[PDB]
Nucleic acid binder design. Structure first.
Ligand code: NA
Length: 741
DNA sequence: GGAGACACGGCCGTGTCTC
């Protein structure tokens, strides 16, 4: 199968490289006659020759329009006549782009920002990750003692053969390979990768830590960090605001971005994520404990176990998600490296671009939400279930032909009109998106049929994934319509789908209350929470599953709902803000928790203690008491200043800042005194009492003296503690005035 | 090419997630 595409430059000409795994072997095929191009709409076709004369400079090399060919395409369901302009190198596009548009005869340009290797996949009809090839995979993690200043203590890895650890101190455990030095540890890990020859290297946050650290130690220790199959090092790319790492010939599959896009929980640690997916706790050994262990030589077995489990948990996490991302890559028609790192929004973009090319539909340029909100029931509810609405929206798009090319169409015999908002949509022909959405579902059902028929357990799990991948993709179109940088953006399309949704949501809530006796506690654009007052947990589950079968029978065709989970209890504050606890006593908040370094520990600690009293123990009055004592204690100067420190990172040169927050005020005073302030530096400040802007009163905690300085009790009460609990407790009829001392 | 989900200090710009 096709694993990735890139290009290389030979004699100024782009050469496409197609990385493949066919018949068990890894091979790189090449293509030398694929040409970059853009499109251009001209006011006057006579001017194409002068447009062909437009030049530009690229590293002092002359860039020009090599060829021009007139082409008839369709733009948003209407014929359009543009000029396809060819070039020599893909790097010519951004050098000459704007001069072609700046030309007075050229109205605009189209398909001018499509990466060359992706353009290739689309145009040649190539689908990555397709077919029957078992890919070999290896997980790995590191343990480290300025970035990459200290040495790497351990490198763990895991696969089918098991999970081992490489360290440079003698640890008597069977899975621990003991090596002489850190350099030889890294070198030993390089051998194992080249020897196992995996197709996929799995990591957790390897884009922003593992690889980069490994680079800088190998940079310092004089090792050439070769993981690429052709002999290259890992390339650290830049994805706008963040970094990312490719390994040529292999697929670096970082689990972190995938997981955040897939599931929803407050803290995205390796243990939390593993606990949410596999329902088993994992011990976390902290960085203060590791240094202590490595320094003395006391507890290196526990540190070595933690590193081994890190590798093993990552591999089995890798085994769960990769097949799904594999399938999404086949549907979208882009590499797993890209699809694994994209937003749901951009997954729909690349799907639509590929389909646009197949139907000869010219792509619109980039520019470069909202929904149902029932006010929830108040207080703490026993035995809650969540049912998902998202499945409604694709069928709504399909049935009502909702598309930008069908919006307010001129001169049709049939129209479906949206409720409330009143937008119209043509019915004489099927829209671009709706017909594509229709086929995604028709394919999903055809997959489900063949799924049940086939009994090969491995292919029964493979076809299960394919169907699941179509669901994630189909469920993304609704959101994509209102996506900010969306090519096929249409606010009317979204409002309309929302409007038509209300009916089915209303009807669903109506049925579940009357025919089944539930009370809906919270309902939003995505789903709703519900219970049966006075009922046992098992009844609720049983009755909920009975409702699912009923409602999906009544809602025509592919109109569906899903049963997501049961929760022992919860409360509900406002839109997208609630908290729940499952039968395993695992708390799950949305839009409430504040577990971040820019909030003080006292605020974090008190909130967590409040969520515990309410959810695990069911004592709201104890939660109120907790906050009362804390606010009393803050004002009496009994809370340790260590719990009051705010950590905040400066992210570029101090001169760049257009607006000064507290941490930028603290940093600028340090810089005025010569003290090192670089991007990445972390200001840890505390707020002293008195007058002035918070920034004027804030000092560094290093410069803090408990005896001399007096922190700002009012600030930590009113701006930190109370804001973190007020909202939660407001859903129980408690106001700020009830919480202060 | 290159997310999003959503806060608060100060007069929307900026930061946090992971490691
Ligand atoms: Na122009």
């Amino acid at each position: 199968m096709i694993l990735d595409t890139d290009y290389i430059t030979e004699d100024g000409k782009p050469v496409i490289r197609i990385f493949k795994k066919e018949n068990g072997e890894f091979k790189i095929d090449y293509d030398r006659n694929f040409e970059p191009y853009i499109y251009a709409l001209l006011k006057d076709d006579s001017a194409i020759e002068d447009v062909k004369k437009i030049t530009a400079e690229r590293h002092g090399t002359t860039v020009r329009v090599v060829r021009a060919e007139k082409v008839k395409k369709k733009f948003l369901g209407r014929p359009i006549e543009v000029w396809k302009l060819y070039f020599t190198h893909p790097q010519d596009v951004p050098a000459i782009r704007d001069k072609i548009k700046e030309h007075p005869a050229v109205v605009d340009i189209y398909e001018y920002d499509i990466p060359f290797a992706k353009r290739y996949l689309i145009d040649k009809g190539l689908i990555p990750m397709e077919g029957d090839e078992e890919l070999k995979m290896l997980a790995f993690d590191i343990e480290t003692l300025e970035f990459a200043e200290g040495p790497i203590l351990m490198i763990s890895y895991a696969d089918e053969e098991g999970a081992r650890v490489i360290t440079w101190k003698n640890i008597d455990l069977p899975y621990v390979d003991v090596v002489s030095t850190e350099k030889e540890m890294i070198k030993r890990f390089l051998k194992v990768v080249k020897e196992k020859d995996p197709d996929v290297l799995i990591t957790y946050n390897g884009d922003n830590f593992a690889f980069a650290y490994l680079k800088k130690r190998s940079e310092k220790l004089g090792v050439k960090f070769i993981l690429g199959r052709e002999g290259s090092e890992p390339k650290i790319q830049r994805m706008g605001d963040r970094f990312a790492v490719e390994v040529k010939g292999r697929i670096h599959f970082d689990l972190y971005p995938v997981i955040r896009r897939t599931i929803n929980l407050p803290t995205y640690t390796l243990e939390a994520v593993y606990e949410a997916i596999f329902g088993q706790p994992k011990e976390k050994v902290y960085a203060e404990e590791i240094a202590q262990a490595w320094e003395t030589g006391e507890g290196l077995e526990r540190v070595a176990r933690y590193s081994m489990e890190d590798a093993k948990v990552t591999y089995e996490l890798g085994k769960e998600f990769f097949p799904m991302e594999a399938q999404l890559s086949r549907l979208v028609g882009q590499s797993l490296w890209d699809v694994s790192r994209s937003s749901t929004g951009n997954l729909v973009e690349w799907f639509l671009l590929r389909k646009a090319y197949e139907r000869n539909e010219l792509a619109p340029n980039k520019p470069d939400a909202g929904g149902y909100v029932k006010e929830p029931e108040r207080g703490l509810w026993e035995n809650i279930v969540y049912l998902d609405f998202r499945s409604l929206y694709p069928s709504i798009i399909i049935t009502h032909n909702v598309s930008p090319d069908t919006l307010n169409r001129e001169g049709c015999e049939e129209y479906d009109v949206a409720p409330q908002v009143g937008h119209k949509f043509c019915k004489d022909f099927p829209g671009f998106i709706p017909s594509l959405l229709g086929d995604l579902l028709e394919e999903r059902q055809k997959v489900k049929k063949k799924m049940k028929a086939t009994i090969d357990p491995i292919e029964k799990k493979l076809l299960d994934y394919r169907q699941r991948a179509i669901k994630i993709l189909a469920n993304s179109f609704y959101g994509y319509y209102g996506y900010a940088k969306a090519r096929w953006y249409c606010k009317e399309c979204a409002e309309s789908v929302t409007a038509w949704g209300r009916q089915y949501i209303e009807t669903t809530i109506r049925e579940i209350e009357e025919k089944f006796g539930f009370k809906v506690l919270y309902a939003d654009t995505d789903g709703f929470f519900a219970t049966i007052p006075g009922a046992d947990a098992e009844t609720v589950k049983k009755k909920a599953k009975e409702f699912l079968d009923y409602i999906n029978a009544k809602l025509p065709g592919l109109l569906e709902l899903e049963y997501e989970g049961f929760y022992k209890r919860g409360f509900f504050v406002t839109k997208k803000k609630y908290a729940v606890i499952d039968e395993e006593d695992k708390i799950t908040t949305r839009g409430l928790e504040i577990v971040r370094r820019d909030w003080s520990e006292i605020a974090k600690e008190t909130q967590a203690r409040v969520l515990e009293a309410i959810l695990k123990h069911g004592d709201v009055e104890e939660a109120v008491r907790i906050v009362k004592e804390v606010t009393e204690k803050l004002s009496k100067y009994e809370v340790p200043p260590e719990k009051l420190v705010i950590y905040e990172q400066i992210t570029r040169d101090l001169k760049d800042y257009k607006a000064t927050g507290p941490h930028v005020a603290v940093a600028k005073r340090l810089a005025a005194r010569g003290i090192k302030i670089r991007p990445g530096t972390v200001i840890s400040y505390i707020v002293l009492k008195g007058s002035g802007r918070i920034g004027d009163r804030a000092i560094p905690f290093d410069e803090f003296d408990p005896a001399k300085h007096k922190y700002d009790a009012e600030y930590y009460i009113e701006n930190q503690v109370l804001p973190a609990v007020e909202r939660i407790l407001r859903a129980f009829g408690y106001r700020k005035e009830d919480l202060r001392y």
